[PDB]
Amino acid sequence: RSYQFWDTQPVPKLGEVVNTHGPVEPDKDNIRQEPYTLPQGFTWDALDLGDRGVLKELYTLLNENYVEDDDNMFRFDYSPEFLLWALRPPGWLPQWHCGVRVVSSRKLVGFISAIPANIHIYDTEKKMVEINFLCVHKKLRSKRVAPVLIREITRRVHLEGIFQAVYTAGVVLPKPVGTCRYWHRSLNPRKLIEVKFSHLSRNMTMQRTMKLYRLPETPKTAGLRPMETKDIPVVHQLLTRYLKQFHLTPVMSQEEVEHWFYPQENIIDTFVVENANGEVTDFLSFYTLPSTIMNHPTHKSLKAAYSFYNVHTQTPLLDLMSDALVLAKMKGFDVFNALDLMENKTFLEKLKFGIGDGNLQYYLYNWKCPSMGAEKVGLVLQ
Ligand SMILES: CCCCCCCCCCCCCC(=O)SCCNC(=O)CCNC(=O)[C@H](O)C(C)(C)COP(=O)(O)OP(=O)(O)OC[C@H]1O[C@@H](n2cnc3c(N)ncnc32)[C@H](O)[C@@H]1OP(=O)(O)O
Ligand SMILES: [Mg+2]
């Protein structure tokens, strides 16, 4: 393989073994003032997501043109309110919600975003951005619009004095810092089989399968309740302490922990364990991201929960994650998804998750370091 675009970028080569830790190139001290040129007939437009019409145009571009599974059966369906949670966290900047429109019709056909984040990578903490929501309309694919969108958001980030970034993708590019796998835990196996997310497995009847996946109707952990405003400080303390053990993690302020964890229905759920002394000792969290089931006459949507950050100090993680399943089931989810990062491999098989297809690769831009095992990746992105 060569990479016509990625070979020009300050990332390590696929196959180069990395022993050192540091930037790939030194920081730029004069940056290009003009936007990169789009192909004829298309124009940049910075999207004001606080305008409901504009946010709905972004909802529509992503609903019709964003990530599908490996078999072209399911497409993410991020909701407008979820996209406001994902894209306006503390420190968001309007120039970093970077849209491409057709000049004549004004139709939105491309987007890429950055949001700021402090990242801990081995022994270094650096201010970075997280790049997400790169999308080109299906009618514009394979025309090298993606390199323009990546160079343009690179420029706009460099203008604000930031020279590293973190991102994930399901394709292999120069050069993954860590390689993760999604696993899936059936909550509504009948629907999952029916829409062919799942198959009737290996000598089990549907009757047996529904039994195999049946869960308790209420969680078992004493003192589990939703996170409230008074818990913001201790959730922040728990998380900060917990993440020290991994090699790629976010460093969140208390304002960022309020944004990422405070519960918002149909977006983000966080439950804390408040013990018999009134102290919060653990928490679990998961976010809501349904998928469209394409071209299907009856079932139009699959409701999935995604494991976010789960912190245990007194409750065994196995038991916390069992309660997350019970909770997602009560909340009407069809499937609970989790990656094999952090300590998750200690529960995935025990709790009857099955491995999925594909991988999720993590990447750093303009930062060279040794790659790490999934168990040392402690960052989860939307
Ligand atoms: C300091 C600040 C730095 C900030 C920037 C940091 C870097 C951020 C990097 C981006 C992080 C994004 C994180 C997420 O959002 S990952 C989610 C990505 N989105 C989707 O999968 C949605 C559905 N697919 C699409 O919309 C398009 O197929 C996309 C837009 C993905 C590519 O459009 P198209 O298919 O029409 O292709 P092209 O002809 O224009 O371009 C072909 C070039 O693009 C390279 N390519 C393909 N897929 C990806 C990918 N996911 N990341 C990076 N590069 C990608 C490909 O290898 C080739 O380069 P090279 O092989 O020739 O070298
Ligand atoms: Mg293209």
Residue numbers in the entry: 115 to 496
What does the paper say about this structure?
Protein N-myristoylation is a co- and post-translational modification in eukaryotes catalysed by the enzyme N-myristoyltransferase (NMT), which transfers myristate from myristoyl coenzyme A (Myr-CoA) to the N-terminal glycine of a wide range of substrate proteins. Both human NMT isozymes, NMT1 and NMT2, are expressed in most tissues and have been implicated in the development and progression of diseases including cancer, epilepsy, Alzheimer’s disease, Noonan-like syndrome and viral and bacterial infections. N-myristoylation is necessarily preceded by proteolysis to reveal an N-terminal glycine, the only completely conserved motif across all known NMT substrates. We present X-ray crystal structures of human NMT1 and NMT2 providing structural evidence for a highly conserved protein substrate-binding pocket, and demonstrate selective target engagement and pharmacological knockdown of N-myristoylation by an NMT inhibitor in live cells.
Comparison of the first crystal structure of NMT2 with that of NMT1 reveals a highly conserved active site, consistent with similar kinetic parameters in simple recombinant enzyme assays. 1 binds at the protein substrate-binding pocket in the presence of Myr-CoA, and interacts with minimal disturbance of side-chain geometry, suggesting that it binds tightly to a pocket pre-organized by binding of myristoyl-CoA27, and confirming its conserved mode of action as a dual NMT1/2 inhibitor.
